[PDB]
């Protein structure tokens, strides 16, 4: 067949259509800004804009920004951020995402020092559904940390950054990269022996421990000592933790990923049926019908 030498025409989304309001923080590969849509049907809408600068030379951050875009286009879940636009200019990549009005879980944790078990059970329950959804698509999230868990106006969670995630992990395939925050890494990530979706359940345990106690379970004087402490996995259990919390933590902190809670044939059901989550109605939770624990004039002359 002979090629028809013609070009398709489209009205392209451009960064000039988003008014820059303020910097929200730093994602895995660039800054995140609060922006307001100028034109079109969604004029006046607030969004979070993630920008990757000098994308042409930054090959590794560019390949992963594309994977992040691909992941966000594929996913449709209540607890995973929605992507509204993705576009590029010379040397820059842009992702336009939901603006989460409640800020991140790290800010809340830092202010409270530690959460009550009721609050932890809520956050972890929504997170378990989000992680399982990703796992069902062959994705390893890998970057669990409270900075990556955002809260909406109602107090429900959203996972928002997929730059360090891994796609196409199914059957006998393993990932071998060493990316993410060290303290949350599974031992198989630290020793470079290969990791699968079961690495996320170790990270889920670290996050659970940190939210319940205000401290990290495996941590040394520097990142290299933290790495060896993860490999020894000698856990000091704080005595204010309930028997249900202690059971879940011991079941997640299995160094052998094959023996870890959630790695068995029933997958996420092993976690959902744990006594720690016995009061959770998972159907109501998915429907966003469970009330979150936190939801983000003087003149008088009657
Ligand atoms: C990170 O801090 C905030 C984020 C947000 N909202 C927000 N919606 C987002 C959607 C996607 C990504 C981010 C984001 C923003 C900054 C750092 C991030 N790390 C992971 N995700 C990050 C969003 O941040 C709102 C905040 O206050 C109202 C806020 O406190 C300054």
Q: Where are the domains of the chain?
A: 1-100, 101-302
Residue with the nearest Cα to atom 26 of ligand 1? 103
Q: How many CB atoms lie within 10 A of CB 9?
A: 6
Identify whether the C-beta of residue 176 lies closer than 8 Å to the C-beta of residue 194.
yes
Identify whether the C-beta of residue 294 lies closer than 8 Å to the C-beta of residue 155.
yes
Smallest Cα–Cα separation from 122: which of 299, 288, 301? 288
Q: Is the Cα dihedral 141, 143, 148, 154 positive or negative?
A: positive
**What residues have CB less than 8 Å from 191, skipping those under 6 apart?**
231
Q: The tokens 């010379």 sit on which residue?
A: 90
Cite the DSSP H helix spans in the chain. Answer: 59-74, 105-112, 117-136, 187-190, 198-213, 223-232, 243-252, 269-272, 282-286
DSSP per-residue letters across 142-207: ----GGGEEE-TTS-EEE---TT-B----TT--B----S-GGG--HHHHTTS-B-THHHHHHHHHH
Phi and psi at residue 96, in whole multiples of 5°?
Answer: -105, 115
Smallest Cα–Cα separation from 244: which of 105, 113, 120, 110? 120
Burial class of residue 87 in the structure, from the number of CB atoms within 10 Å of its CB (0-12 exposed, 13-18 middle, 19+ buried): middle
Identify whether the C-beta of residue 128 lies closer than 8 Å to the C-beta of residue 271.
yes
Chain breaks in the chain (C to N over 2.5 A) after: 296
State how beta strands 18-26 and 31-37 pair.
Answer: antiparallel
Determine the Cα–Cα distance for residues 80 and 76; give it in Å rounded to an integer.
7
Q: Is the Cα dihedral 267, 208, 115, 276 positive or negative?
A: positive
Which of 100, 102, 154 has most ligand 1 atoms within 8 Å of CB, for mutation? Answer: 100
Smallest Cα–Cα separation from 202: which of 127, 120, 144? 144
**What residues have CB less than 8 Å from 234, skipping those under 6 apart?**
none
Q: Residues with Cβ within 6 A of ligand 1?
A: 24-27, 32, 48, 81, 97-101, 103-104, 147-148, 150, 160-161
Identify whether the C-beta of residue 117 lies closer than 8 Å to the C-beta of residue 242.
yes
Smallest Cα–Cα separation from 47: which of 79, 17, 10, 88? 17
Which of 36, 48, 99, 102 has most ligand 1 atoms within 8 Å of CB, for mutation? Answer: 48
Q: The tokens 């669990």 sit on which residue?
A: 144
In the chain, what are the helix, strand and coil shares in percent, each to the nearest 5?
35, 15, 50
Q: Yes or no: is domain 101-302 CATH 1.10.510.10? A: yes
Structure tokens, 3: 């090629």
CA angle 173, 177, 178 (to 5 degrees): 140
Q: The tokens 């959630």 sit on which residue?
A: 262
Task: Please state which CATH number belongs to domain 1-100.
Answer: 3.30.200.20
Instruction: Please say if 301 is a catalytic residue.
Output: no
**What residues have CB less than 8 Å from 10, skipping those under 6 apart?**
none
Identify whether the C-beta of residue 204 lies closer than 8 Å to the C-beta of residue 159.
no
Is residue 31 marked as binding?
yes
Residue with the nearest Cα to atom 30 of ligand 1? 103
- Compute the distance from residue 104 Cα to the ligand 1 centre, in Å: 6
Determine the Cα–Cα distance for residues 248 and 208; give it in Å rounded to an integer.
9
Q: Is the Cα dihedral 108, 225, 271, 148 positive or negative?
A: positive
Q: How many CB atoms lie within 10 A of CB 254?
A: 19
- Compute the distance from residue 33 Cα to the ligand 1 centre, in Å: 8
Structure tokens, 211: 């939210």
- Compute the distance from residue 81 Cα to the ligand 1 centre, in Å: 11
Q: How many CB atoms lie within 10 A of CB 133?
A: 19
Structure tokens, 106: 């790290």
Burial class of residue 11 in the structure, from the number of CB atoms within 10 Å of its CB (0-12 exposed, 13-18 middle, 19+ buried): exposed
CA angle 87, 88, 94 (to 5 degrees): 65
């Amino acid at each position: 067949a002979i090629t028809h030498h013609v070009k398709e025409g489209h009205e392209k989304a451009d960064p000039s259509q988003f008014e820059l309001l303020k910097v929200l923080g730093q994602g895995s590969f660039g800054k995140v800004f609060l922006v307001k849509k100028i034109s079109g049907s969604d004029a006046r809408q607030l969004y979070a804009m993630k920008v990757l600068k000098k994308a042409t030379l930054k090959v590794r951050d560019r390949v992963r920004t594309k994977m992040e875009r691909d992941i966000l286009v594929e996913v449709n879940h209540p607890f995973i951020v929605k992507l509204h636009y993705a576009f590029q200019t010379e040397g820059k990549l842009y992702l336009i995402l939901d603006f989460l009005r409640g800020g991140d879980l790290f800010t809340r944790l830092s202010k409270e020092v530690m959460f009550t078990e009721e609050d932890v059970k809520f956050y972890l329950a929504e997170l378990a559904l989000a992680l399982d959804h990703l796992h069902s698509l062959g994705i390893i999230y890998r970057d669990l940390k409270p900075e990556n868990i955002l809260l909406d106006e109602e107090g429900h969670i959203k996972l928002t950054d997929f730059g360090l995630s891994k796609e196409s992990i199914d059957h006998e395939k393993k990932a071998y990269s060493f990316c993410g925050t060290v303290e949350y890494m599974a031992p198989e990530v630290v020793n470079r022996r290969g990791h699968t979706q079961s690495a996320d359940w170790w990270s889920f345990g670290v996050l659970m421990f940190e939210m319940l106690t205000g401290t990290l379970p495996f941590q040394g004087k520097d990142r290299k000592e933290t790495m060896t402490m993860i490999l020894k996995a000698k856990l000091g259990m704080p005595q204010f933790l309930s028997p249900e919390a202690q059971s879940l933590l011991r079941m997640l902190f299995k160094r052998n990923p094959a023996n870890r809670l959630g790695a068995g044939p029933d997958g996420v059901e092993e976690i959902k049926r744990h006594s720690f989550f016995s009061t959770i109605d998972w159907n109501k939770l998915y429907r966003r019908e469970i009330h979150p624990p936190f939801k983000p004039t003087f003149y008088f002359d009657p």
